[PDB]
Design a protein around this motif. Structure first.
Motif, mmCIF file in Angstrom:
data_model
loop_
_atom_site.group_PDB
_atom_site.id
_atom_site.type_symbol
_atom_site.label_atom_id
_atom_site.label_comp_id
_atom_site.label_asym_id
_atom_site.label_seq_id
_atom_site.Cartn_x
_atom_site.Cartn_y
_atom_site.Cartn_z
ATOM 1 N N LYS A 1 0.830 -1.201 0.000
ATOM 2 C CA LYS A 1 0.000 0.000 0.000
ATOM 3 C C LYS A 1 0.866 1.254 0.000
ATOM 4 O O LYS A 1 0.709 2.135 -0.857
ATOM 5 C CB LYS A 1 -0.936 -0.007 1.210
ATOM 6 N N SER A 2 1.796 1.343 0.954
ATOM 7 C CA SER A 2 2.667 2.507 1.053
ATOM 8 C C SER A 2 3.589 2.626 -0.153
ATOM 9 O O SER A 2 3.924 3.741 -0.567
ATOM 10 C CB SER A 2 3.481 2.436 2.345
ATOM 11 N N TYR A 3 4.010 1.495 -0.725
ATOM 12 C CA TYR A 3 4.833 1.544 -1.929
ATOM 13 C C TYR A 3 4.049 2.105 -3.107
ATOM 14 O O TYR A 3 4.578 2.900 -3.891
ATOM 15 C CB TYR A 3 5.370 0.149 -2.260
ATOM 16 N N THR B 1 1.165 2.341 15.623
ATOM 17 C CA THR B 1 1.681 1.516 14.539
ATOM 18 C C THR B 1 1.010 1.868 13.217
ATOM 19 O O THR B 1 -0.202 2.091 13.154
ATOM 20 C CB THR B 1 1.470 0.035 14.864
ATOM 21 N N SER B 2 1.818 1.927 12.154
ATOM 22 C CA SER B 2 1.290 2.242 10.830
ATOM 23 C C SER B 2 0.368 1.145 10.314
ATOM 24 O O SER B 2 -0.605 1.439 9.610
ATOM 25 C CB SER B 2 2.438 2.470 9.848
ATOM 26 N N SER B 3 0.652 -0.115 10.648
ATOM 27 C CA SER B 3 -0.227 -1.206 10.247
ATOM 28 C C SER B 3 -1.569 -1.166 10.963
ATOM 29 O O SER B 3 -2.489 -1.884 10.555
ATOM 30 C CB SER B 3 0.455 -2.554 10.498
ATOM 31 N N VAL C 1 -5.200 8.173 0.556
ATOM 32 C CA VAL C 1 -5.410 7.479 1.824
ATOM 33 C C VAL C 1 -4.595 6.195 1.834
ATOM 34 O O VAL C 1 -4.831 5.298 1.015
ATOM 35 C CB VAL C 1 -6.896 7.170 2.059
ATOM 36 N N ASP C 2 -3.655 6.100 2.772
ATOM 37 C CA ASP C 2 -2.929 4.868 3.058
ATOM 38 C C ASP C 2 -3.627 4.203 4.239
ATOM 39 O O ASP C 2 -3.520 4.672 5.378
ATOM 40 C CB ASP C 2 -1.460 5.154 3.357
ATOM 41 N N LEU C 3 -4.356 3.127 3.959
ATOM 42 C CA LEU C 3 -5.140 2.442 4.971
ATOM 43 C C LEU C 3 -4.246 1.580 5.857
ATOM 44 O O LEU C 3 -3.079 1.320 5.554
ATOM 45 C CB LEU C 3 -6.220 1.581 4.317
ATOM 46 N N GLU D 1 9.571 -0.533 12.183
ATOM 47 C CA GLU D 1 8.984 -1.659 11.462
ATOM 48 C C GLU D 1 8.327 -1.220 10.160
ATOM 49 O O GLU D 1 8.234 -2.012 9.216
ATOM 50 C CB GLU D 1 7.970 -2.386 12.348
ATOM 51 N N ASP D 2 7.855 0.023 10.093
ATOM 52 C CA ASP D 2 7.359 0.567 8.837
ATOM 53 C C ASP D 2 8.550 1.097 8.050
ATOM 54 O O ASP D 2 9.198 2.059 8.482
ATOM 55 C CB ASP D 2 6.325 1.669 9.081
ATOM 56 N N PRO D 3 8.881 0.489 6.907
ATOM 57 C CA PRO D 3 10.044 0.963 6.139
ATOM 58 C C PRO D 3 9.944 2.421 5.730
ATOM 59 O O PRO D 3 10.973 3.101 5.638
ATOM 60 C CB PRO D 3 10.057 0.033 4.918
#
Ligand SMILES: Nc1ncnc2c1ncn2[C@@H]1O[C@H](COP(=O)(O)OP(=O)(O)O)[C@@H](O)[C@H]1O
Ligand SMILES: [Mg+2]
Length: 812
Positions: free
Chosen positions: A109-111, A219-221, A252-254, A439-441
């Motif tokens: 998603k983030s990529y 956390t981003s996740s 939007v990054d879910l 943990e979130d690149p």
């Protein structure tokens, strides 16, 4: 006028390849995605607007960009030319757009949205092309305004990523403008004139996001991140007075789309996702009597109500992983994108005359002023007469911005500090510093702590003294560690306590230890950093969170093969955060990873089981959770920790609702026993004692079990002499197992029983429950076999019965 759904497949990352994962995703055309079951070969075939194949046929160039080799690889530029071109066309036309990425944590998603290093995603090049297209194509006398905003949604709380002001309680307010829909009240909207400005603004937004993720475990996740770009085209000297066209893009990054206790798992964390699954479903079932769509059940579905069937052009990117293990989640993703595919939205052009817009805003201001008039002289609900003043102030700011020229707007916003980043990047070349490792690149190497040239102390104390580096947030003590810098030539790190679990290069630290270039220091919770001395050797910034956690898991496993390592890499950090959250939330509970080897189960090869031992120091009770149960109740713990950090009144909650408490009469896997069945292999009737071992491997007791052969009638067979167990093959022989009695059980146990599964029975045998710590189970069950098979003969002759003990510790 329907949604645009597009799925994208990332390539195998560097740890799935060594794990030997099969590709389960195929894209025949640029429309279809085929998911094939690994153990079944059954295919499911989905169709979308785009099936982006980013798995095969690419080459990493020297610049780092992944260029497609075959015409099938979906590079970043292709995803752009298909979707960012669309969002730019929508922005220029006057339609407000919304692009969101759904998918699993790690699917991409983030990529797809933002990108990563020289593979920029939708946001950067869409902003860049918007500003270029402003500066190039549009002639005549027109002004152009670009405003950027950025918010995070976490546990149904909205937090302003572009505001250094401390956040309110319960997050920012979400209100429904009667004509425009749901919006966030008092959300920072800065005017940006060039692409560099919006880039730096989103950069500091991601910096705030990183600080939240590392210090409060936001956390981003488990959180959503929205970037809101408003594009205004003001045209003057027309037939009418003057007009403005307006577009509102939402990128939007879910959050990640990925029992015994209901209320002790998550409810508020997954809410925005849960109802997102509901709303979509509710929108798909509409295809002949009306149903209701639950937009108001969560903040996300409120803020995306126009995107999900209202006044908006909506684009969706479903990121999926091409691996075996994720086949389920991938399918769910592919099904979610399948349901949202049937969404029709009615986007309209937003043109409004400037004078009439000002007049409408002023009449709403007057309505609110009359409401407060009716307040002070009437009901005066002190709850309501504050909400009304909030709305009045927001309308007032909007009117003040309408009258203002865009030059004055950018001037006022530039009057309010960016030299902090310049001098930070500058002194990173002169001063020793630890940089973030998350943990979130997308958040790694974003924040940084500088090490002064003297002897300073790292701790959670808001400075107010000399020689102090402040780390704040989870697990950090008022005086955590002591750093000693010798002129940026020799740095020594010393923990301020013997009960303080801090690591260097994964190896635990017990005393003064000299840091060296590119060392990987872990202080606790999420405070994982890499040390850099800019004066010595050669620094490094390409160290991933996966490498540090990999070496930590390696050292931990050596203290107590890659399947086990990659699983400790998932469990250990969560256990660290669980211990820190427990000790911070007032819960006197300690979590420790206990692993059960195949040899502990009477096996030679096999997967190693991971358990989380749970010690409730208060009440002095012990438990043992399966890894999955620990994951769910860790979701619960994270929710509770956020509830405390917000300063709520309901974080310290009753026993039935908090994730750290477990009732004492809950059964717990306490002991193991390995009963070798060799006696049955030679048809001899014996009863001996077998060691009882706790999960530390230590032998603690003896379990007398009975082993004897008997005929299918039930009688004691016939007295032959077995010299090789294959003599049993072809004969109708039954074998009874008598769990007679055990001794040496823990004194804390008051009720216990045994559990096992004999060869090929798929019926878990469990004995009765007996009182004392030396219980007489008195169990018995024959196991019939029509032909005693060579498999059964080998079982009896070379394997063993794996008997597990389950007990309770306090009264009922
Ligand atoms: N389409 C892709 N092409 C190349 N690499 C990818 C792709 N998608 C994801 N990755 C890699 O996978 C890693 C994790 O993906 P990420 O963007 O974190 O997904 P999510 O945010 O949904 O977990 C990133 O570091 C990135 O390098
Ligand atoms: Mg992400």
């Amino acid at each position: 006028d329907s949604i645009i759904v597009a799925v994208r497949v990332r390539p195998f990352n560097d740890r799935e390849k060594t794990r030997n994962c099969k590709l389960v995703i195929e894209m025949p055309d640029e429309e279809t995605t085929v998911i094939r079951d690994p153990k079944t070969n059954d295919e499911k075939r989905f169709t979308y607007d785009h099936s982006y194949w980013s798995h095969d046929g690419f080459s990493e160039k020297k610049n780092g960009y992944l260029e497609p080799t075959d015409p099938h690889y979906a590079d970043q530029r292709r995803v752009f030319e298909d979707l960012g071109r669309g969002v730019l066309a929508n922005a220029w036309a006057g339609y407000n757009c919304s692009l969101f990425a759904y998918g699993q944590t790690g699917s991409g998603k983030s990529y797809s949205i933002v990108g990563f290093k020289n593979n920029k995603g939708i946001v950067p090049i869409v902003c860049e092309e918007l500003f270029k297209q402003i500066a190039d194509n549009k002639k005549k006398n027109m002004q152009f305004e670009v405003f950027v905003s950025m918010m995070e949604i976490y546990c149904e709380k909205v937090r302003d990523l572009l505001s250094s002001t401390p956040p309110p309680k319960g997050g920012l307010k979400v209100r429904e403008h009667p004509k425009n829909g749901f919006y966030v009240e008092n959300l920072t909207t800065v005017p940006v004139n060039s692409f560099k400005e919006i880039e730096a603004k989103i950069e500091e937004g991601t910096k705030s996001r990183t600080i939240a993720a590392t210090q409060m475990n936001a956390t981003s996740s488990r959180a959503h991140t929205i970037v809101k770009i408003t594009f205004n085209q003001k045209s003057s000297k027309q037939a009418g007075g003057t007009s403005m066209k307006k577009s509102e893009i939402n990128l939007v990054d879910l959050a990640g789309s990925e029992e015994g206790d209901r209320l002790k798992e998550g409810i508020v964390i997954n809410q925005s996702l849960t109802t997102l699954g509901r709303v979509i479903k509710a929108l798909h079932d509409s295809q002949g009597k009306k149903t209701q769509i639950p937009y108001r059940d969560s903040v996300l579905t409120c803020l995306l109500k126009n995107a999900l069937g209202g006044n908006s052009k909506t684009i969706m990117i479903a990121a999926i992983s091409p691996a075996d293990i994720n086949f389920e989640e991938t399918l769910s993703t592919l099904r979610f994108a399948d349901r949202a595919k049937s969404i029709k939205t009615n986007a309209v052009v937003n043109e409004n005359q400037t004078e009439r817009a000002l007049r409408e805003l002023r009449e709403e201001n007057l309505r609110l002023q009359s409401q407060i008039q009716g307040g002070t002289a009437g009901d005066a609900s002190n709850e309501e007469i504050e909400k009304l003043r909030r709305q009045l102030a927001e309308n007032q700011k909007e009117m003040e911005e309408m009258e203002k020229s865009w030059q004055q707007k950018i001037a006022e916003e530039a009057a309010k500090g960016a030299s902090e980043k310049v001098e930070m990047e500058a002194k990173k070349k002169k001063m020793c510093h630890l940089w973030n490792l998350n943990e979130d690149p997308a958040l790694t190497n974003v924040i940084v702590h500088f090490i002064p040239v003297g002897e300073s102390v790292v701790g959670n104390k808001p400075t107010s003294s000399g020689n102090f580096i402040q780390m704040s947030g989870l697990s950090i003590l008022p005086q955590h560690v002591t750093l000693k810098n010798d002129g940026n030539n020799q740095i020594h790190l010393s923990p301020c306590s013997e009960d303080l679990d801090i690591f260097i290069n994964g190896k635990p630290v017990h005393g003064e230890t000299q840091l060296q270039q590119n060392d990987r220091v872990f202080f606790g919770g999420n405070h994982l950093y890499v040390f850099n001395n800019p004066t010595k050797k050669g620094i490094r910034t390409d160290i991933t969170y996966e490498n540090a956690q990999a070496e930590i898991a390696q050292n931990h496993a050596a203290a107590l093969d890659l399947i086990l390592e990659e699983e400790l890499m998932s469990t250990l950090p969560l256990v660290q955060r669980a211990n820190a959250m427990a000790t911070e939330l007032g819960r006197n509970v300690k979590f420790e990873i206990v692993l059960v080897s195949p040899e502990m189960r009477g096996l030679t090869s096999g997967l190693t089981e991971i358990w989380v031992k749970v010690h409730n120091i208060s009440e002095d009770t012990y438990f043992l959770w399966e890894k999955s149960r620990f994951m769910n109740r860790y979701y619960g713990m994270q929710e509770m920790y956020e509830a405390k950090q917000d300063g709520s009144e309901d974080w310290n909650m009753p026993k039935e609702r908090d994730p750290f408490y477990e009732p004492p009469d809950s059964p717990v896997f306490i002991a193991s026993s390995v009963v070798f069945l060799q006696s049955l292999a030679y048809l001899i009737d014996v009863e001996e004692q077998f060691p009882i071992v706790d999960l530390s491997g230590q032998e603690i007791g003896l379990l007398t079990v009975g082993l004897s052969p008997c005929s299918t009638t039930g009688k004691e067979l016939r007295g032959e002499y077995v010299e090789d167990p294959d003599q049993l093959i072809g004969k109708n022989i039954a074998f009874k197992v008598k769990v007679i009695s055990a001794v040496g059980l823990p004194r804390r146990i008051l009720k216990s029983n045994c559990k096992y599964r004999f060869f090929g029975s798929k019926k878990m045998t469990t004995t009765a429950t007996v009182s004392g710590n030396t219980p007489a189970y008195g169990h018995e069950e024959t196991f019939q076999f029509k032909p005693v098979t060579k498999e059964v003969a080998d079982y009896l002759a070379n394997s063993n019965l794996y008997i597990t003990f389950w007990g309770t510790q306090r009264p009922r």
